[PDB]
Amino acid sequence: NDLVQLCNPHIAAMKEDILYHFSLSTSTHDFPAMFGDVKFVCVGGSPSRMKAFIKYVAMELGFAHPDYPNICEGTDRYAMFKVGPVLSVSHGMGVPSIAIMLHELIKLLYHAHCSGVTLIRIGTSGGIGLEPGSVVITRQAVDPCFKPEFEQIVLGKREVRNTDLDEQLVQELARCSAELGEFPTVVGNTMCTLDFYEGQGRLDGALCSYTEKDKQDYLRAAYAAGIRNIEMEASVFAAMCNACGLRAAVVCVTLLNRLEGDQISSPHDVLAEYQQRPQRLVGQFIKKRLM
Amino acid sequence: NDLVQLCNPHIAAMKEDILYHFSLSTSTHDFPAMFGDVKFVCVGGSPSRMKAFIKYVAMELGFAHPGADYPNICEGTDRYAMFKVGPVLSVSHGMGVPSIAIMLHELIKLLYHAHCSGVTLIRIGTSGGIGLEPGSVVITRQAVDPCFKPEFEQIVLGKREVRNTDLDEQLVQELARCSAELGEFPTVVGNTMCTLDFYEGQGRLDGALCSYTEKDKQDYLRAAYAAGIRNIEMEASVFAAMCNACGLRAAVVCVTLLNRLEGDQISSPHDVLAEYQQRPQRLVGQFIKKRLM
Protein backbone atom coordinates (compact mmCIF):
# COMPACT_ATOMS: atom_id res chain seq x y z
CA ASN A 1 0.00 0.00 0.00
CA ASP A 2 2.93 2.36 -0.68
CA LEU A 3 2.65 5.65 -2.56
CA VAL A 4 3.75 5.63 -6.19
CA GLN A 5 7.19 7.25 -6.64
CA LEU A 6 9.40 8.42 -9.54
CA CYS A 7 13.03 8.01 -10.62
CA ASN A 8 13.16 11.58 -11.80
CA PRO A 9 13.75 14.44 -9.31
CA HIS A 10 13.09 16.97 -12.08
CA ILE A 11 9.35 16.29 -11.94
CA ALA A 12 9.06 17.57 -8.36
CA ALA A 13 10.83 20.78 -9.39
CA MET A 14 8.44 21.52 -12.26
CA LYS A 15 5.73 24.14 -11.88
CA GLU A 16 3.65 22.25 -14.44
CA ASP A 17 3.93 18.65 -15.66
CA ILE A 18 2.10 18.20 -18.95
CA LEU A 19 1.25 14.65 -20.02
CA TYR A 20 1.43 15.41 -23.71
CA HIS A 21 -0.10 12.22 -25.09
CA PHE A 22 -3.01 12.13 -22.62
CA SER A 23 -3.87 15.84 -22.94
CA LEU A 24 -3.62 16.15 -19.17
CA SER A 25 -1.59 18.54 -17.02
CA THR A 26 -1.01 19.27 -13.35
CA SER A 27 -2.24 22.84 -13.86
CA THR A 28 -5.45 21.94 -15.69
CA HIS A 29 -6.44 18.75 -13.85
CA ASP A 30 -6.75 17.56 -10.26
CA PHE A 31 -4.94 14.20 -10.31
CA PRO A 32 -5.76 13.05 -6.76
CA ALA A 33 -9.45 13.78 -7.35
CA MET A 34 -9.47 12.14 -10.79
CA PHE A 35 -7.31 9.07 -10.10
CA GLY A 36 -6.46 8.90 -6.40
CA ASP A 37 -8.67 5.85 -5.87
CA VAL A 38 -7.00 3.85 -8.69
CA LYS A 39 -5.69 0.50 -7.46
CA PHE A 40 -5.70 -1.55 -10.67
CA VAL A 41 -4.21 -0.48 -14.00
CA CYS A 42 -4.71 -2.74 -16.98
CA VAL A 43 -2.89 -1.97 -20.25
CA GLY A 44 -2.95 -3.35 -23.80
CA GLY A 45 -2.27 -2.31 -27.39
CA SER A 46 -5.57 -1.12 -28.83
CA PRO A 47 -8.18 1.44 -27.65
CA SER A 48 -10.97 -0.99 -28.58
CA ARG A 49 -9.49 -3.84 -26.50
CA MET A 50 -9.14 -1.54 -23.51
CA LYS A 51 -12.62 -0.06 -23.78
CA ALA A 52 -14.08 -3.57 -23.96
CA PHE A 53 -12.01 -4.47 -20.90
CA ILE A 54 -13.46 -1.58 -18.89
CA LYS A 55 -17.06 -2.42 -19.89
CA TYR A 56 -16.44 -6.06 -19.02
CA VAL A 57 -15.05 -5.36 -15.55
CA ALA A 58 -17.71 -2.72 -14.93
CA MET A 59 -20.30 -5.48 -15.38
CA GLU A 60 -18.34 -8.14 -13.46
CA LEU A 61 -17.76 -5.76 -10.55
CA GLY A 62 -21.37 -4.62 -10.26
CA PHE A 63 -20.77 -1.06 -11.42
CA ALA A 64 -22.60 -1.64 -14.71
CA HIS A 65 -26.07 -0.17 -15.18
CA PRO A 66 -28.72 -0.32 -17.91
CA ASP A 67 -21.25 5.65 -20.73
CA TYR A 68 -17.50 4.92 -20.54
CA PRO A 69 -15.85 8.10 -21.87
CA ASN A 70 -12.31 8.30 -23.16
CA ILE A 71 -10.39 10.34 -20.59
CA CYS A 72 -7.91 11.27 -23.33
CA GLU A 73 -8.77 13.38 -26.33
CA GLY A 74 -9.98 11.36 -29.33
CA THR A 75 -7.01 12.84 -31.15
CA ASP A 76 -4.47 11.43 -28.64
CA ARG A 77 -2.45 8.32 -29.46
CA TYR A 78 -3.58 6.60 -26.25
CA ALA A 79 -7.06 5.98 -24.90
CA MET A 80 -7.91 5.78 -21.21
CA PHE A 81 -11.04 4.61 -19.34
CA LYS A 82 -11.93 4.45 -15.65
CA VAL A 83 -14.51 2.65 -13.52
CA GLY A 84 -14.15 2.70 -9.77
CA PRO A 85 -10.62 1.70 -8.75
CA VAL A 86 -9.86 0.26 -12.21
CA LEU A 87 -8.00 2.25 -14.87
CA SER A 88 -7.66 1.00 -18.46
CA VAL A 89 -5.07 2.47 -20.87
CA SER A 90 -4.04 1.56 -24.45
CA HIS A 91 -0.34 1.74 -25.39
CA GLY A 92 -0.15 1.22 -29.16
CA MET A 93 2.33 -1.07 -30.90
CA GLY A 94 5.99 -1.62 -30.12
CA VAL A 95 8.47 -0.77 -27.39
CA PRO A 96 8.73 2.97 -28.26
CA SER A 97 4.95 3.48 -28.06
CA ILE A 98 4.39 1.64 -24.80
CA ALA A 99 7.39 3.38 -23.15
CA ILE A 100 5.96 6.83 -23.83
CA MET A 101 2.58 5.79 -22.44
CA LEU A 102 4.23 4.26 -19.35
CA HIS A 103 6.33 7.36 -18.63
CA GLU A 104 3.19 9.47 -18.58
CA LEU A 105 1.02 6.91 -16.77
CA ILE A 106 3.60 6.47 -13.99
CA LYS A 107 3.80 10.26 -13.54
CA LEU A 108 -0.03 10.31 -13.46
CA LEU A 109 -0.18 7.72 -10.67
CA TYR A 110 2.46 9.76 -8.80
CA HIS A 111 0.53 13.01 -9.17
CA ALA A 112 -2.64 11.26 -8.01
CA HIS A 113 -0.89 9.91 -4.91
CA CYS A 114 -2.07 6.39 -5.75
CA SER A 115 -1.07 3.58 -3.39
CA GLY A 116 -1.02 -0.21 -3.40
CA VAL A 117 -1.26 -0.17 -7.18
CA THR A 118 -1.07 -3.20 -9.48
CA LEU A 119 -0.20 -2.94 -13.21
CA ILE A 120 -1.04 -5.70 -15.67
CA ARG A 121 -0.50 -5.89 -19.44
CA ILE A 122 -3.03 -8.02 -21.34
CA GLY A 123 -2.77 -9.11 -24.97
CA THR A 124 -2.16 -11.85 -27.52
CA SER A 125 1.03 -13.66 -28.46
CA GLY A 126 2.61 -16.47 -30.46
CA GLY A 127 2.98 -19.61 -28.37
CA ILE A 128 5.83 -22.10 -28.31
CA GLY A 129 5.05 -25.70 -27.28
CA LEU A 130 1.55 -24.92 -25.99
CA GLU A 131 -1.89 -25.49 -27.53
CA PRO A 132 -3.44 -22.36 -29.07
CA GLY A 133 -5.59 -20.54 -26.55
CA SER A 134 -3.22 -21.19 -23.63
CA VAL A 135 -2.72 -18.23 -21.33
CA VAL A 136 0.85 -17.44 -20.25
CA ILE A 137 1.51 -15.53 -17.04
CA THR A 138 4.98 -14.14 -17.67
CA ARG A 139 7.67 -14.86 -15.10
CA GLN A 140 10.46 -12.96 -16.88
CA ALA A 141 10.08 -10.89 -20.03
CA VAL A 142 13.10 -12.04 -21.97
CA ASP A 143 15.11 -10.64 -24.90
CA PRO A 144 15.75 -12.56 -28.15
CA CYS A 145 18.91 -14.02 -26.56
CA PHE A 146 16.75 -15.37 -23.70
CA LYS A 147 18.15 -12.91 -21.15
CA PRO A 148 15.87 -11.23 -18.53
CA GLU A 149 17.37 -7.83 -19.35
CA PHE A 150 16.12 -4.83 -21.27
CA GLU A 151 18.71 -2.43 -22.68
CA GLN A 152 18.40 1.19 -23.58
CA ILE A 153 20.84 3.94 -24.48
CA VAL A 154 20.77 7.06 -22.30
CA LEU A 155 23.02 9.79 -23.71
CA GLY A 156 24.91 7.27 -25.83
CA LYS A 157 25.48 4.85 -22.94
CA ARG A 158 23.82 1.47 -22.38
CA GLU A 159 21.63 0.99 -19.30
CA VAL A 160 20.36 -2.51 -18.48
CA ARG A 161 17.25 -3.19 -16.39
CA ASN A 162 16.03 -6.49 -14.99
CA THR A 163 12.72 -7.71 -16.45
CA ASP A 164 11.44 -10.07 -13.74
CA LEU A 165 7.75 -9.67 -13.15
CA ASP A 166 6.39 -9.56 -9.57
CA GLU A 167 6.75 -13.12 -8.27
CA GLN A 168 3.96 -13.13 -5.68
CA LEU A 169 1.73 -11.56 -8.33
CA VAL A 170 2.35 -14.33 -10.88
CA GLN A 171 1.46 -16.98 -8.27
CA GLU A 172 -1.72 -15.11 -7.33
CA LEU A 173 -2.78 -14.83 -10.97
CA ALA A 174 -2.07 -18.55 -11.34
CA ARG A 175 -4.40 -19.29 -8.39
CA CYS A 176 -7.03 -17.00 -9.88
CA SER A 177 -6.97 -18.90 -13.15
CA ALA A 178 -7.25 -22.24 -11.30
CA GLU A 179 -10.40 -20.89 -9.65
CA LEU A 180 -11.92 -20.19 -13.07
CA GLY A 181 -11.14 -23.61 -14.54
CA GLU A 182 -11.92 -22.34 -18.05
CA PHE A 183 -8.66 -22.56 -20.02
CA PRO A 184 -5.03 -23.77 -19.67
CA THR A 185 -2.69 -21.31 -17.95
CA VAL A 186 1.05 -21.74 -17.43
CA VAL A 187 3.80 -19.73 -15.81
CA GLY A 188 6.57 -19.23 -18.36
CA ASN A 189 9.01 -16.68 -19.75
CA THR A 190 7.96 -14.34 -22.53
CA MET A 191 10.31 -13.30 -25.32
CA CYS A 192 9.84 -9.69 -26.43
CA THR A 193 11.25 -8.63 -29.83
CA LEU A 194 11.77 -5.24 -31.45
CA ASP A 195 10.95 -6.61 -34.88
CA PHE A 196 8.08 -8.77 -36.14
CA TYR A 197 9.32 -10.21 -39.47
CA GLU A 198 13.03 -10.94 -38.92
CA GLY A 199 13.05 -10.54 -35.15
CA GLN A 200 10.57 -13.37 -34.58
CA GLY A 201 12.18 -15.54 -37.27
CA ARG A 202 9.22 -15.43 -39.64
CA LEU A 203 9.72 -16.54 -43.25
CA ASP A 204 7.34 -14.09 -44.92
CA GLY A 205 9.05 -10.72 -44.62
CA ALA A 206 10.68 -8.84 -47.48
CA LEU A 207 13.99 -9.91 -45.94
CA CYS A 208 14.79 -13.44 -44.77
CA SER A 209 18.22 -15.07 -44.80
CA TYR A 210 17.22 -18.29 -42.98
CA THR A 211 15.05 -21.39 -43.39
CA GLU A 212 12.13 -23.10 -41.65
CA LYS A 213 14.70 -25.44 -40.14
CA ASP A 214 16.73 -22.52 -38.76
CA LYS A 215 13.59 -21.03 -37.25
CA GLN A 216 12.64 -24.29 -35.56
CA ASP A 217 16.08 -24.78 -34.01
CA TYR A 218 15.76 -21.30 -32.52
CA LEU A 219 12.21 -21.78 -31.23
CA ARG A 220 13.17 -25.14 -29.70
CA ALA A 221 16.17 -23.45 -28.11
CA ALA A 222 13.86 -20.75 -26.70
CA TYR A 223 11.51 -23.40 -25.32
CA ALA A 224 14.42 -25.19 -23.65
CA ALA A 225 15.26 -21.89 -21.97
CA GLY A 226 11.78 -21.63 -20.41
CA ILE A 227 10.07 -19.37 -22.99
CA ARG A 228 6.46 -20.19 -23.83
CA ASN A 229 5.37 -17.19 -25.88
CA ILE A 230 6.53 -14.23 -27.97
CA GLU A 231 5.23 -10.70 -28.17
CA MET A 232 6.48 -7.12 -28.60
CA GLU A 233 5.84 -4.95 -25.51
CA ALA A 234 6.54 -7.03 -22.35
CA SER A 235 10.21 -6.18 -21.83
CA VAL A 236 9.95 -2.36 -21.44
CA PHE A 237 6.86 -2.77 -19.33
CA ALA A 238 8.59 -5.13 -16.90
CA ALA A 239 11.74 -2.98 -16.88
CA MET A 240 10.00 0.34 -16.16
CA CYS A 241 7.72 -1.03 -13.46
CA ASN A 242 10.80 -2.62 -11.82
CA ALA A 243 12.66 0.69 -11.99
CA CYS A 244 9.81 2.49 -10.23
CA GLY A 245 9.12 -0.26 -7.71
CA LEU A 246 5.67 -1.03 -9.11
CA ARG A 247 4.04 -4.47 -8.86
CA ALA A 248 3.41 -5.62 -12.41
CA ALA A 249 2.24 -8.64 -14.40
CA VAL A 250 1.89 -9.71 -18.05
CA VAL A 251 -1.02 -11.94 -19.11
CA CYS A 252 -1.14 -13.00 -22.76
CA VAL A 253 -3.14 -15.67 -24.57
CA THR A 254 -1.48 -17.64 -27.38
CA LEU A 255 -3.13 -17.59 -30.83
CA LEU A 256 -1.08 -20.44 -32.32
CA ASN A 257 1.76 -22.84 -31.61
CA ARG A 258 4.65 -21.62 -33.73
CA LEU A 259 6.25 -25.08 -33.50
CA GLU A 260 3.51 -26.11 -35.94
CA GLY A 261 4.32 -23.25 -38.30
CA ASP A 262 2.99 -19.69 -38.39
CA GLN A 263 -0.49 -20.51 -39.68
CA ILE A 264 -3.33 -19.39 -37.40
CA SER A 265 -5.80 -22.12 -38.29
CA SER A 266 -8.32 -21.64 -35.46
CA PRO A 267 -11.80 -20.57 -36.71
CA HIS A 268 -13.08 -17.03 -36.11
CA ASP A 269 -15.41 -17.99 -33.25
CA VAL A 270 -12.63 -19.81 -31.44
CA LEU A 271 -10.25 -16.86 -31.83
CA ALA A 272 -12.86 -14.45 -30.43
CA GLU A 273 -13.00 -16.77 -27.43
CA TYR A 274 -9.20 -16.86 -27.08
CA GLN A 275 -9.02 -13.05 -27.29
CA GLN A 276 -11.08 -12.52 -24.10
CA ARG A 277 -9.15 -14.96 -21.91
CA PRO A 278 -6.60 -12.44 -20.58
CA GLN A 279 -9.48 -10.11 -19.66
CA ARG A 280 -11.43 -12.88 -17.85
CA LEU A 281 -8.40 -13.80 -15.76
CA VAL A 282 -7.60 -10.19 -14.84
CA GLY A 283 -11.24 -9.55 -13.92
CA GLN A 284 -11.16 -12.51 -11.53
CA PHE A 285 -7.96 -11.14 -10.03
CA ILE A 286 -9.63 -7.75 -9.51
CA LYS A 287 -12.86 -9.31 -8.22
CA LYS A 288 -10.95 -11.36 -5.63
CA ARG A 289 -8.85 -8.38 -4.50
CA LEU A 290 -11.99 -6.29 -3.95
CA MET A 291 -13.74 -9.05 -1.95
CA ASN B 1 14.69 1.41 -64.09
CA ASP B 2 15.39 -1.81 -62.23
CA LEU B 3 12.58 -4.00 -60.92
CA VAL B 4 12.04 -3.88 -57.16
CA GLN B 5 13.54 -7.07 -55.70
CA LEU B 6 13.16 -8.87 -52.37
CA CYS B 7 15.77 -10.47 -50.14
CA ASN B 8 13.51 -13.40 -49.34
CA PRO B 9 13.30 -16.46 -51.64
CA HIS B 10 10.19 -17.67 -49.81
CA ILE B 11 7.89 -15.01 -51.25
CA ALA B 12 8.11 -16.01 -54.91
CA ALA B 13 7.40 -19.61 -53.86
CA MET B 14 4.09 -18.69 -52.21
CA LYS B 15 0.77 -19.43 -53.85
CA GLU B 16 -0.62 -16.51 -51.83
CA ASP B 17 1.16 -13.56 -50.17
CA ILE B 18 -0.92 -11.79 -47.53
CA LEU B 19 0.09 -8.34 -46.30
CA TYR B 20 -1.36 -8.89 -42.83
CA HIS B 21 -1.14 -5.33 -41.58
CA PHE B 22 -2.36 -3.62 -44.76
CA SER B 23 -4.96 -6.41 -45.00
CA LEU B 24 -4.21 -6.75 -48.72
CA SER B 25 -3.69 -10.03 -50.56
CA THR B 26 -2.32 -11.08 -53.96
CA SER B 27 -5.37 -13.32 -54.31
CA THR B 28 -7.95 -10.63 -53.45
CA HIS B 29 -6.25 -7.57 -54.96
CA ASP B 30 -4.68 -6.90 -58.35
CA PHE B 31 -1.32 -5.41 -57.32
CA PRO B 32 -0.01 -4.62 -60.84
CA ALA B 33 -3.30 -2.89 -61.68
CA MET B 34 -3.34 -0.95 -58.41
CA PHE B 35 0.29 0.10 -58.04
CA GLY B 36 2.20 -0.95 -61.15
CA ASP B 37 2.92 2.62 -62.24
CA VAL B 38 4.21 3.85 -58.86
CA LYS B 39 7.59 5.61 -59.12
CA PHE B 40 7.59 7.67 -55.91
CA VAL B 41 6.90 6.34 -52.44
CA CYS B 42 6.66 8.93 -49.70
CA VAL B 43 6.28 7.62 -46.12
CA GLY B 44 5.68 9.25 -42.72
CA GLY B 45 4.22 8.79 -39.25
CA SER B 46 0.52 9.67 -39.36
CA PRO B 47 -2.33 9.17 -41.85
CA SER B 48 -3.05 12.89 -41.58
CA ARG B 49 0.52 13.87 -42.54
CA MET B 50 0.40 11.47 -45.50
CA LYS B 51 -3.07 12.46 -46.69
CA ALA B 52 -2.01 16.11 -46.64
CA PHE B 53 1.00 15.04 -48.67
CA ILE B 54 -0.96 13.21 -51.39
CA LYS B 55 -3.36 16.16 -51.67
CA TYR B 56 -0.48 18.59 -52.00
CA VAL B 57 1.33 16.64 -54.70
CA ALA B 58 -1.85 15.86 -56.68
CA MET B 59 -2.35 19.62 -57.00
CA GLU B 60 1.29 20.33 -57.96
CA LEU B 61 1.41 17.54 -60.54
CA GLY B 62 -1.86 18.64 -62.13
CA PHE B 63 -3.94 15.63 -61.07
CA ALA B 64 -6.16 17.51 -58.66
CA HIS B 65 -9.86 17.75 -59.41
CA PRO B 66 -12.46 19.51 -57.26
CA GLY B 67 -13.86 17.95 -55.25
CA ALA B 68 -12.83 14.34 -55.58
CA ASP B 69 -11.08 12.66 -52.68
CA TYR B 70 -8.09 10.36 -52.31
CA PRO B 71 -9.44 7.48 -50.22
CA ASN B 72 -7.43 5.22 -47.93
CA ILE B 73 -6.34 2.01 -49.69
CA CYS B 74 -5.28 0.08 -46.59
CA GLU B 75 -7.89 -2.23 -45.09
CA GLY B 76 -6.13 -3.36 -41.89
CA THR B 77 -4.78 -1.71 -38.75
CA ASP B 78 -5.37 2.02 -38.73
CA ARG B 79 -1.63 2.72 -38.06
CA TYR B 80 -1.07 2.24 -41.76
CA ALA B 81 -2.97 4.37 -44.25
CA MET B 82 -2.24 4.49 -47.98
CA PHE B 83 -3.04 6.99 -50.74
CA LYS B 84 -2.26 6.88 -54.46
CA VAL B 85 -2.36 9.54 -57.19
CA GLY B 86 -0.66 8.90 -60.51
CA PRO B 87 2.89 7.63 -59.93
CA VAL B 88 2.88 8.76 -56.30
CA LEU B 89 2.11 6.45 -53.38
CA SER B 90 1.74 7.93 -49.88
CA VAL B 91 1.96 5.65 -46.78
CA SER B 92 1.81 6.23 -43.03
CA HIS B 93 4.11 4.03 -40.87
CA GLY B 94 3.10 4.84 -37.27
CA MET B 95 5.47 5.57 -34.42
CA GLY B 96 8.76 3.85 -33.77
CA VAL B 97 11.17 1.33 -35.28
CA PRO B 98 8.92 -1.74 -34.78
CA SER B 99 5.86 -0.08 -36.39
CA ILE B 100 7.78 1.26 -39.40
CA ALA B 101 9.74 -1.98 -39.92
CA ILE B 102 6.41 -3.82 -40.33
CA MET B 103 5.21 -1.27 -42.82
CA LEU B 104 8.46 -1.48 -44.84
CA HIS B 105 8.35 -5.29 -45.09
CA GLU B 106 4.80 -5.17 -46.44
CA LEU B 107 5.31 -2.12 -48.63
CA ILE B 108 8.44 -3.50 -50.30
CA LYS B 109 6.57 -6.73 -51.07
CA LEU B 110 3.67 -4.69 -52.44
CA LEU B 111 6.01 -2.92 -54.89
CA TYR B 112 7.52 -6.26 -55.82
CA HIS B 113 4.10 -7.86 -56.56
CA ALA B 114 3.03 -4.78 -58.54
CA HIS B 115 6.27 -5.15 -60.53
CA CYS B 116 7.27 -1.54 -59.92
CA SER B 117 10.56 -0.33 -61.37
CA GLY B 118 12.70 2.78 -60.96
CA VAL B 119 11.19 3.60 -57.57
CA THR B 120 12.32 6.32 -55.15
CA LEU B 121 11.46 6.10 -51.39
CA ILE B 122 11.39 9.20 -49.21
CA ARG B 123 10.48 9.62 -45.54
CA ILE B 124 9.07 12.97 -44.44
CA GLY B 125 8.48 14.14 -40.88
CA THR B 126 9.29 16.52 -38.06
CA SER B 127 12.27 16.24 -35.71
CA GLY B 128 14.24 17.88 -32.93
CA GLY B 129 16.99 20.13 -34.27
CA ILE B 130 20.55 20.55 -33.00
CA GLY B 131 22.24 23.89 -33.78
CA LEU B 132 19.67 24.97 -36.40
CA GLU B 133 16.94 27.59 -36.38
CA PRO B 134 13.49 26.06 -35.90
CA GLY B 135 11.76 25.41 -39.21
CA SER B 136 14.98 24.26 -40.93
CA VAL B 137 14.81 21.16 -43.13
CA VAL B 138 17.47 18.47 -42.83
CA ILE B 139 18.11 16.11 -45.68
CA THR B 140 19.66 13.12 -43.93
CA ARG B 141 23.12 12.00 -45.35
CA GLN B 142 23.45 9.20 -42.80
CA ALA B 143 20.92 7.97 -40.27
CA VAL B 144 22.99 7.38 -37.20
CA ASP B 145 22.48 5.55 -33.89
CA PRO B 146 22.64 7.13 -30.39
CA CYS B 147 26.45 6.64 -30.48
CA PHE B 148 26.65 8.55 -33.78
CA LYS B 149 27.48 5.45 -35.88
CA PRO B 150 25.81 4.82 -39.27
CA GLU B 151 24.69 1.34 -38.18
CA PHE B 152 21.38 -0.37 -37.48
CA GLU B 153 21.67 -3.45 -35.29
CA GLN B 154 19.03 -6.19 -35.41
CA ILE B 155 18.75 -9.57 -33.66
CA VAL B 156 18.20 -12.52 -35.99
CA LEU B 157 17.80 -16.04 -34.61
CA GLY B 158 19.43 -14.84 -31.40
CA LYS B 159 22.27 -13.43 -33.50
CA ARG B 160 23.19 -9.73 -33.70
CA GLU B 161 23.38 -8.35 -37.24
CA VAL B 162 24.49 -4.85 -38.27
CA ARG B 163 23.39 -2.94 -41.37
CA ASN B 164 24.70 0.30 -42.88
CA THR B 165 22.39 3.33 -42.77
CA ASP B 166 23.84 5.68 -45.43
CA LEU B 167 21.20 7.30 -47.63
CA ASP B 168 21.62 7.71 -51.40
CA GLU B 169 24.24 10.44 -51.92
CA GLN B 170 23.18 11.63 -55.36
CA LEU B 171 19.63 11.76 -53.98
CA VAL B 172 20.58 14.08 -51.13
CA GLN B 173 22.23 16.49 -53.62
CA GLU B 174 19.23 16.47 -55.96
CA LEU B 175 17.01 17.30 -53.00
CA ALA B 176 19.38 20.06 -51.93
CA ARG B 177 19.20 21.54 -55.46
CA CYS B 178 15.40 21.26 -55.41
CA SER B 179 15.26 23.15 -52.13
CA ALA B 180 17.51 25.93 -53.48
CA GLU B 181 15.10 26.22 -56.39
CA LEU B 182 12.23 26.90 -53.99
CA GLY B 183 14.04 29.55 -51.95
CA GLU B 184 11.47 29.24 -49.15
CA PHE B 185 13.25 27.90 -46.08
CA PRO B 186 16.72 26.93 -44.83
CA THR B 187 17.74 23.42 -45.84
CA VAL B 188 20.94 21.68 -44.72
CA VAL B 189 22.39 18.25 -45.37
CA GLY B 190 23.49 16.56 -42.15
CA ASN B 191 23.24 13.39 -40.15
CA THR B 192 20.06 12.35 -38.38
CA MET B 193 20.16 10.58 -35.04
CA CYS B 194 17.53 7.85 -34.68
CA THR B 195 16.58 6.83 -31.11
CA LEU B 196 14.50 3.81 -30.18
CA ASP B 197 13.13 5.63 -27.13
CA PHE B 198 11.68 9.13 -26.58
CA TYR B 199 12.04 10.30 -22.95
CA GLU B 200 15.36 8.69 -22.00
CA GLY B 201 16.52 7.81 -25.52
CA GLN B 202 16.58 11.48 -26.51
CA GLY B 203 17.85 12.60 -23.13
CA ARG B 204 14.77 14.54 -22.08
CA LEU B 205 14.35 15.67 -18.46
CA ASP B 206 10.58 15.17 -18.17
CA GLY B 207 10.04 11.41 -18.15
CA ALA B 208 9.20 9.17 -15.20
CA LEU B 209 12.84 8.06 -15.08
CA CYS B 210 15.86 10.34 -15.47
CA SER B 211 19.38 9.88 -14.09
CA TYR B 212 20.99 12.96 -15.69
CA THR B 213 20.94 16.76 -15.73
CA GLU B 214 20.49 19.55 -18.30
CA LYS B 215 24.28 19.93 -18.37
CA ASP B 216 24.64 16.22 -19.17
CA LYS B 217 22.04 16.49 -21.94
CA GLN B 218 23.59 19.58 -23.50
CA ASP B 219 27.07 18.06 -23.46
CA TYR B 220 25.66 15.02 -25.29
CA LEU B 221 23.90 17.18 -27.86
CA ARG B 222 27.05 19.24 -28.43
CA ALA B 223 28.95 15.99 -29.04
CA ALA B 224 26.22 14.93 -31.49
CA TYR B 225 26.53 18.26 -33.30
CA ALA B 226 30.34 17.92 -33.46
CA ALA B 227 29.81 14.52 -35.08
CA GLY B 228 27.70 16.04 -37.90
CA ILE B 229 24.20 15.48 -36.49
CA ARG B 230 21.61 18.21 -37.00
CA ASN B 231 18.35 16.50 -36.00
CA ILE B 232 16.89 13.65 -33.95
CA GLU B 233 13.89 11.41 -34.63
CA MET B 234 12.64 7.85 -34.14
CA GLU B 235 12.47 5.97 -37.47
CA ALA B 236 15.31 7.00 -39.84
CA SER B 237 17.71 4.10 -39.11
CA VAL B 238 15.49 1.14 -40.01
CA PHE B 239 14.25 3.02 -43.03
CA ALA B 240 17.78 3.48 -44.36
CA ALA B 241 18.86 -0.02 -43.32
CA MET B 242 15.91 -1.75 -45.00
CA CYS B 243 16.13 0.30 -48.20
CA ASN B 244 19.87 -0.38 -48.43
CA ALA B 245 19.23 -4.10 -47.93
CA CYS B 246 16.79 -4.27 -50.84
CA GLY B 247 18.85 -1.88 -52.96
CA LEU B 248 16.22 0.86 -53.01
CA ARG B 249 17.18 4.51 -53.50
CA ALA B 250 15.95 6.39 -50.45
CA ALA B 251 15.99 9.74 -48.70
CA VAL B 252 14.86 11.28 -45.40
CA VAL B 253 13.59 14.86 -45.31
CA CYS B 254 12.56 16.24 -41.92
CA VAL B 255 11.73 19.73 -40.62
CA THR B 256 12.91 20.74 -37.14
CA LEU B 257 10.38 22.07 -34.63
CA LEU B 258 12.90 23.53 -32.19
CA ASN B 259 16.63 23.98 -31.69
CA ARG B 260 16.80 21.46 -28.84
CA LEU B 261 20.02 22.95 -27.48
CA GLU B 262 18.08 26.06 -26.44
CA GLY B 263 16.10 23.57 -24.34
CA ASP B 264 13.08 21.40 -25.11
CA GLN B 265 10.38 24.07 -25.20
CA ILE B 266 8.71 24.64 -28.54
CA SER B 267 8.28 28.41 -28.64
CA SER B 268 6.93 28.72 -32.19
CA PRO B 269 3.26 29.85 -32.39
CA HIS B 270 0.59 27.48 -33.77
CA ASP B 271 0.46 29.40 -37.08
CA VAL B 272 4.22 29.04 -37.56
CA LEU B 273 4.28 25.35 -36.63
CA ALA B 274 1.52 24.58 -39.15
CA GLU B 275 3.77 26.12 -41.79
CA TYR B 276 6.83 24.20 -40.62
CA GLN B 277 4.77 21.00 -40.88
CA GLN B 278 4.37 21.49 -44.65
CA ARG B 279 8.04 22.13 -45.48
CA PRO B 280 9.09 18.50 -46.06
CA GLN B 281 5.96 17.98 -48.15
CA ARG B 282 6.81 21.05 -50.25
CA LEU B 283 10.40 20.01 -50.89
CA VAL B 284 9.42 16.46 -51.83
CA GLY B 285 6.58 17.63 -54.10
CA GLN B 286 8.97 19.96 -55.96
CA PHE B 287 11.40 17.05 -56.32
CA ILE B 288 8.73 14.77 -57.80
CA LYS B 289 7.40 17.59 -59.98
CA LYS B 290 10.85 18.15 -61.48
CA ARG B 291 11.53 14.42 -61.94
CA LEU B 292 8.33 14.19 -63.97
CA MET B 293 9.36 17.13 -66.17
B133 SS3 class: coil
> Is B141 known to sit in a ligand binding site?
no
In DSSP notation, A36-92 reads: TT--EEEEES-HHHHHHHHHHHHHHHT--------SS-TTSSS-EEEETTEEEEE--
CB contact under 8 A, A144 and B154: no
Here the CATH number for the domain that contains residue B150 is: 3.40.50.1580
CB contact under 8 A, A206 and B102: no
> Is A277 known to sit in a ligand binding site?
no
- Testing the interface with A: which of B14, B155, B260 to mutate, by most A Cβ within 10 A? B155
CB contact under 8 A, A199 and B79: no
Q: Which of A110, A196, A208 sits opposite B101 (nearest CB)?
A: A196
A206: phi then psi, degrees, rounded to nearest 5: -75, -20
Domain count within chain A: 1
> Is A216 known to sit in a ligand binding site?
no
The answer to whether B228 contacts chain A (CB < 8 Å) is no
Specify the resolution in Å: 2.1
The answer to whether B158 contacts chain A (CB < 8 Å) is yes
If we measure between CA atoms, which residue out of B114, B66, B67 comes closest to residue B89? Answer: B114
**Consecutive H or E run containing B120:** strand B120-129
Q: Supply the range of the domain harboring residue A11.
A: 1-291
* Residue A17 · residue A11 · CB < 8 Å: yes
> Is B187 known to sit in a ligand binding site?
no
* Residue B208 · residue A244 · CB < 8 Å: yes
Q: Which residue(s) pair with A81 in the sheet?
A: A88
Give the Cα separation of B1 and B117 in Å (integer): 5
Q: Which chain B residues touch A95 with a CB distance below 8 Å?
A: 96-98, 196-197
Give the Cα separation of B69 and B92 in Å (integer): 17
Residue A252: CA count within 13 A, CB half-sphere: 30
Give the Cα separation of A204 and A198 in Å (integer): 9
End-to-end CA distance of chain A, in Å? 17
* Residue B225 · residue B129 · CB < 8 Å: no
Q: How far is A155 from chain B (nearest CA, A)?
A: 6
A150-161 in b/e burial notation, b at 16+ Cβ within 10 A? bebbbbeeeeeb
Q: How far is A250 from chain B (nearest CA, A)?
A: 20
Question: Which are the contacts of A225, defined by CB distance < 8 A and separation ≥ 6?
Answer: A142, A146, A189
The answer to whether B86 contacts chain A (CB < 8 Å) is no
Q: Chain A: residue nearest B155 by CA?
A: A199
Give the Cα separation of B293 and B87 in Å (integer): 13
CB contact under 8 A, A95 and B197: yes
Give the Cα separation of A93 and B76 in Å (integer): 14
Q: How was this structure determined?
A: X-ray
Give the Cα separation of A186 and A130 in Å (integer): 9
